[PDB]
Amino acid sequence: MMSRLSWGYREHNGPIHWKEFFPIADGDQQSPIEIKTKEVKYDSSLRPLSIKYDPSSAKIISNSGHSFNVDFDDTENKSVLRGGPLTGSYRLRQVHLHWGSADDHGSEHIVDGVSYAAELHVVHWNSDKYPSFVEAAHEPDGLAVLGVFLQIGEPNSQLQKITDTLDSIKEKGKQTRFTNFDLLSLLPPSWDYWTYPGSLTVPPLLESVTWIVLKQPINISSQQLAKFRSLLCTAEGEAAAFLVSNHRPPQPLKGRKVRASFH
Numbered sequence: 553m554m555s556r557l558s559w560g561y562r563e564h565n566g567p568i569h570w571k572e573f574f575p576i577a578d579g580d581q582q583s584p585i586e587i588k589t590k591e592v593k594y595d596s597s598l599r600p601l602s603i604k605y606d607p608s609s610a611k612i613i614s615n616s617g618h619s620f621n622v623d624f625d626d627t628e629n630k631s632v633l634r635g636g637p638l639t640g641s642y643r644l645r646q647v648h649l650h651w652g653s654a655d656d657h658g659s660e661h662i663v664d665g666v667s668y669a670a671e672l673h674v675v676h677w678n679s680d681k682y683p684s685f686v687e688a689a690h691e692p693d694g695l696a697v698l699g700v701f702l703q704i705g706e707p708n709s710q711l712q713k714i715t716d717t718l719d720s721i722k723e724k725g726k727q728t729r730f731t732n733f734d735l736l737s738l739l740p741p742s743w744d745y746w747t748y749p750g751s752l753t754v755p756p757l758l759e760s761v762t763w764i765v766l767k768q769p770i771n772i773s774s775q776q777l778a779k780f781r782s783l784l785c786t787a788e789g790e791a792a793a794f795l796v797s798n799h800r801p802p803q804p805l806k807g808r809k810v811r812a813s814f815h
C-alpha cells in the first residue's frame with residue numbers, strides 16, 4: 553500500500569498517491585515539467601556549462617528499488633558541474649534512469665508534447681555551501697541535475713558498462729563495484745539546454761534542484777531499454793515485482809518560467 557517508506561510506481565503506491573505522504577508533491581516548484589518552447593526565452597546571462605568528470609569517481613552501482621543508482625566519490629572535486637545557471641561548484645553524486653513500460657513514452661520532461669523513451673538524471677550538489685548531499689538537498693540552491701533524453705535509435709555502446717551489471721543487481725538492495733565509468737561520453741554532442749527551478753522527481757520531492765535539461769537526445773535500442781525493465785522493485789525474499797515503469801508525470805509550472813541556453 554502507499555506509505556511514507558513504501559512509495560513506488562505500482563497502482564497503490566505510485567505517483568498519484570505520493571501526495572498522501574509528501575504533500576510537497578502538489579507544490580509550486582515540482583518536477584518534471586512540460587517545456588513549451590514558444591514561451592521559453594534565451595538568456596544571454598547564462599555562462600558556458602563546464603563538465604569536468606573523472607571516470608575513477610564512480611564507485612558502486614545498486615538497485616534502489618526505484619532505478620539503478622551509480623554512486624560517485626563525492627569527497628573531492630574531481631567530478632564537478634559548473635557554469636550555466638549555477639553559482640559555485642556542484643559535485644557529482646549519482647546517476648540514475650527513468651523509463652516507461654513501453655518505448656513510446658517514459659521520459660520525465662516532455663518538450664512540446666514530445667516524450668522520449670527514457671531519461672537519465674545526473675545529480676550534483678553544492679559543496680561550496682553545504683557540508684553533504686543530504687544537507688544540500690534541503691536548500692533551494694543545493695542541487696543541480698542534468699537531464700538527458702534517450703530516444704529509441706541504434707544501440708548505444710556507452711550503455712554497456714551499465715547493462716552488463718543489471719543481472720547482478722536484479723533485486724532491490726543489491727550492489728556491485730562500478731568504477732572507471734565514462735559518464736561524459738553518455739552526454740549528447742550538443743549541450744544546449746533548458747533550465748528552471750524544480751524538485752527531486754521521487755519522494756521526498758524536495759524543491760532544491762536547478763534543472764538543466766539537455767535538448768539533444770542520446771540513443772538507446774529497444775533491446776537495451778527492455779533490460780532495465782527486468783530489474784525488480786522488490787528485495788530478496790519479497791514477492792517479486794518488476795520495475796517496468798519508473799517515471800513521474802510532468803507537474804504544472806505554476807508561474808515558473810523556463811530559460812534557454814541557446815537561440
Ligand SMILES: NS(=O)(=O)c1c(F)c(F)c(SCCO)c(F)c1NC1CCCCCCC1
Pocket residue numbers: 645646648675685686689752753754755756758
Ligand atoms: N545519496 S542519497 O541516498 O541521500 C540520494 C541521492 F544520492 C540522490 F541522487 C537522490 S536524487 C533522486 C533519487 O534518485 C536522492 F533522492 C537521494 N536520497 C534522498 C533521501 C532522503 C534523505 C534526505 C535527502 C534527499 C535525498
Ligand SMILES: [Zn+2]
Pocket residue numbers: 648650673753754
Ligand atoms: Zn531522477
